[PDB]
């Protein structure tokens, strides 16, 4: 029996929470044809207790906390006392929703709040599967939003004015957001093998050729710009079950994680793919550059390095022979843990449009080391094959050589 949860900090926004819940319930019943239940959850972190919300099934603040036990997610330091309280409630909310999602029918979640409440809701909401309606009327929807939404389908409705009581403005904003949510909920209730590919502008020739091949081979494709969030976006989709195979052509995010660039991946890169045990064909695309921008920003120690000014906002740094071995180490240390087929394809000529004969980043000395270092580090991996092809990553034959390698570890 479908159920949705209206969540908010009742100790500071009780009437707004009520008004929203009331409007959601009303809209759900209205838009359907058929019964969706609504539960109001209080995530207040102060001692002020709220025991009810009109006639709604209601969950008090203490009940959310009681299902949770302090974990690693909140062990670090915090700016202030309130930030910590919110961090703990947030994770407690996540546990509360996990439970409701397993032994229950979670049809959708909606909430409201300022930066604090939004921060609290976003974290728990994006932990739910893509597809499930997630909505937050936020006073910080207009501004930097990635720390709230991440790679999810979380929707932040701008509150327009600060959330402080029901007035002619909030009345309309809350009514619209609640109706939108109800629509998503009722609409969902009343209703090919895809390959993921990593890309950079400097490897787009390769990626486009690979994509045309794959579509011709009958696959569905999802291309991700290797900007740090890209790889993460791809991997979250892998554990979400939306991607059955990966052609990680552009692993450039590793360079930034190692050297300390702006579009870095985190220490978890590749884990999602290996844990799912889905076919993986990996390469060294654009591993010749670490992202910065602008020059004035380029950390002091790298100021003497070979820099290429792409734009006024982005400057690329050419990776050194010594750094490439470190890239190999990171990739290898992950791949050697594989428990399923993996193929590493390496382009002997170059790893990007800038790493080619007659280009600003061309350095076959670094490429060669990257190549010999992967071979060596992967030499005893009984699950990984290493292919060294006499081409440049952007050569048409390399692209088709990538899909060939994919087809052999994922026959069709």
């Amino acid at each position: 029996s479908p159920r949705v949860f209206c969540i908010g900090t009742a100790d500071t926004k009780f009437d707004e929470l009520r008004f929203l819940s009331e409007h959601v319930r009303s809209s759900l019943n209205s838009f359907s044809n058929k019964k969706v239940g609504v539960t109001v959850v209080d995530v207040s972190t102060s001692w002020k207790e709220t025991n009810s919300c009109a006639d709604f099934d209601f969950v008090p603040s203490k009940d959310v906390l009681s299902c949770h036990t302090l974990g690693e997610e909140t062990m670090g330091t915090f700016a202030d006392i309130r930030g910590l309280a919110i961090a703990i409630m947030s994770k407690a909310l996540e546990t509360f929703l996990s439970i409701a999602n397993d032994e229950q029918n979670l049809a959708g979640v909606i909430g409201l709040g300022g930066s604090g409440g939004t921060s609290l809701l976003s974290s728990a909401f994006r932990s739910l599967p893509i597809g499930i309606p997630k909505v937050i009327i936020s006073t910080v929807a207009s501004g930097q939003t990635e720390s709230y939404i991440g790679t999810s389908d979380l929707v932040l409705f701008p509150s327009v004015v600060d959330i402080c009581g029901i007035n002619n403005v909030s009345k309309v904003v809350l009514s619209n957001a609640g109706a939108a949510f109800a629509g998503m909920v009722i609409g969902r209730l009343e209703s090919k093998f895809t390959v993921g590919v990593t890309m950079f502008g400097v490897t787009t020739p390769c990626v486009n050729a690979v994509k045309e091949r794959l579509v011709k081979e009958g696959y569905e494709t999802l291309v991700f710009h290797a900007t740090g969030v890209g790889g993460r976006a791809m991997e979250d989709l892998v554990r979400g079950g939306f991607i059955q195979g990966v052609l990680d052509i552009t692993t450039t995010e590793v360079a930034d994680y190692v050297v300390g660039g702006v579009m870095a991946c985190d220490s978890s890169r590749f884990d999602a793919i290996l844990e799912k045990k889905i076919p993986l064909v990996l390469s060294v695309g654009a591993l010749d550059m670490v992202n910065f921008g602008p020059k004035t920003t380029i950390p002091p120690e790298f100021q003497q390095r070979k820099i290429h000014e792409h734009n006024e906002q982005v400057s690329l740094m050419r990776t050194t022979v010594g750094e490439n071995k470190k890239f190999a180490a990171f990739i290898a240390e992950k791949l050697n843990k594989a428990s399923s087929s993996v193929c590493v394809c390496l382009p002997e000529k170059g790893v990007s449009a800038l790493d080619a004969p007659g280009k600003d980043f061309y350095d076959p000395e670094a490429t060669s080391c990257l190549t010999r270092e992967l071979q060596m580090l992967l030499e005893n991996n009984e699950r990984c094959q290493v292919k060294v092809l006499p081409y440049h990553i952007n050569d048409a034959e390399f692209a088709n050589a990538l899909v060939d390698s994919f087809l052999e570890i994922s026959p069709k």
Binding site: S44, T45, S46, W47, S61, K62, L65, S66, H68, T69, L70, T74, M75, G76, T77, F78, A79, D80, I81, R82, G83, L84, A85, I88, M89
Partner: protein, 434 residues
């Protein structure tokens, strides 16, 4: 005694020979511990270079300058009986001199024209330490002990001093601590059962240990215990371990207590130097003293979650005093231990008739059931900040209650208001058995 004689190498040395305008382009080599030790020595050479150089600067253009001829001060110094200073001869030469005194002041010489002293030359600790440390080198290379070093990363009231007092064998071991008040507290708590087991020989301040090394007492210790070792330079810790001749050393540290500070204009003390290299790292995250609310506070300032064995939950409160005068023993008695942040306020409270008053800094490591914290200075007080070690210490001394009386709004008032607002059900999550 023979101390002044042990520092002969520094007596009458030219000011110039001890001044090093650089110590920024220094490159270290060898094992990490070796660089830390070398760097520690250098930090000392640097501090002395600055002290000597400032004295010379004053003579050419706190800081006291004596006219040798009239035996009268041209610029009287704040302190008295300075251990040393720089001498300016009639030919205008500058020398470092170990000072001697008598009924009429500094005992001088015929060729001395003027003498300069300062707060830096009040004590000859840097020289004393430099003397001791260089004697332990074989061509600038320090010896690294093979002794096992265990670091215990703790938090307020988790049992740092308690464990030391419980595990130490006073007949064989040594306990080293940063300040005199710490040492006296340790010796007092060890001797509280009636017998003196903790003396000036098995419990010493780091400065005393370094300055009077070999001078006597006892040298060989089975185990070394350092209370609050993150208050020390890493090289200093490597030295103490080796100098104690211990087989194992236990360094108890707290990442939020006042840390080791450079205090030498752009002196090189990189990040990797500031990290103590040890064989084992143990963590303590259960405070056995602090109430739940203060525990919440500790959770936001420390890496890792902090739990508490205490049943106390809400324990802090504050009060803005309209009239600073109203804060007197008759008008309003302050219960428990009365503390302040500054020496001035402390004097004020004492002059008003309040008994047994101390500053937060003077009661580090101490425990009290109830605390009355007072701020009388409406003017800016540096050490009272939301991230200040003093605020941290001031909030973690009590087991029962704390109350802050202040004449003006400040970060502590916010922190306390915040802690008072926290959900009680959230506070319960920090509780642990025992």
């Amino acid at each position: 005694s023979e101390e002044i004689e042990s520092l002969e190498q520094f007596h009458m040395a030219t000011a110039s020979s001890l001044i090093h305008k650089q110590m920024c382009s220094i490159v270290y080599t060898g094992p990490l511990k070796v660089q830390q030790m070398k760097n520690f020595i250098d930090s000392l050479v640097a501090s002395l270079s600055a002290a000597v150089s400032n004295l010379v600067k004053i003579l050419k253009d706190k800081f006291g300058v004596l006219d040798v001829a009239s035996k009268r001060w041209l610029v009287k110094p704040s302190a008295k009986n300075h251990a040393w200073g720089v001498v300016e001869t009639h030919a205008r030469k500058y020398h470092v001199a170990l000072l001697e005194h008598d009924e009429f002041g500094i005992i001088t010489c015929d060729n001395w024209r003027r003498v300069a002293v300062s707060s830096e030359s009040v004590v000859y600790s840097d020289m004393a330490k430099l003397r001791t440390l260089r004697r332990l080198l074989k061509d600038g290379e320090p010896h690294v002990s093979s002794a096992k070093v265990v670091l215990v990363d703790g938090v307020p009231g988790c049992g740092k001093t308690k464990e030391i007092l419980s595990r130490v064998n006073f007949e064989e071991d040594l306990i080293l601590v940063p300040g005199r008040q710490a040492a006296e507290m340790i010796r007092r708590r060890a001797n509280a059962s009636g017998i003196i087991v903790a003396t000036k020989d098995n419990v010493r301040t780091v400065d005393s240990f370094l300055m009077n090394y070999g001078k006597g007492a006892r040298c060989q210790f089975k185990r070394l215990f350092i209370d609050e070792g993150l208050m020390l330079h890493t090289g200093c810790v490597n030295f103490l371990v080796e100098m104690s001749l211990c087989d194992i050393a236990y360094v108890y540290g707290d990442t939020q207590q006042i840390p080791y500070i450079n205090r030498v204009t752009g002196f090189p003390y990189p990040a990797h130097f500031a990290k103590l290299e040890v064989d084992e790292v143990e963590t303590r995250r259960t405070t056995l003293r602090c109430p739940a609310d203060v525990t919440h506070f500790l959770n936001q300032r420390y890496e890792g979650h902090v739990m508490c064995t205490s049943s106390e939950k809400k324990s802090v409160s504050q009060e803005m005093v309209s009239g600073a005068a109203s804060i007197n023993p008759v008008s309003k008695p302050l219960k428990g231990k009365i503390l302040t942040f500054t020496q001035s306020d402390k004097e004020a409270l004492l002059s008003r008739g309040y008994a047994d008053v101390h500053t937060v800094h003077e009661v580090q490591g101490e425990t009290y059931a109830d605390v009355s914290l007072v701020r009388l200075t409406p003017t800016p007080v540096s050490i009272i900040a939301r991230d200040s070690p003093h605020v941290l210490v001031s909030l973690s001394r009590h087991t029962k209650s704390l109350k802050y009386y202040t004449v003006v709004m400040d970060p502590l008032v916010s922190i306390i208001r915040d802690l008072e607002r926290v959900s009680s059900y959230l506070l319960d999550m920090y509780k642990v058995d025992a």
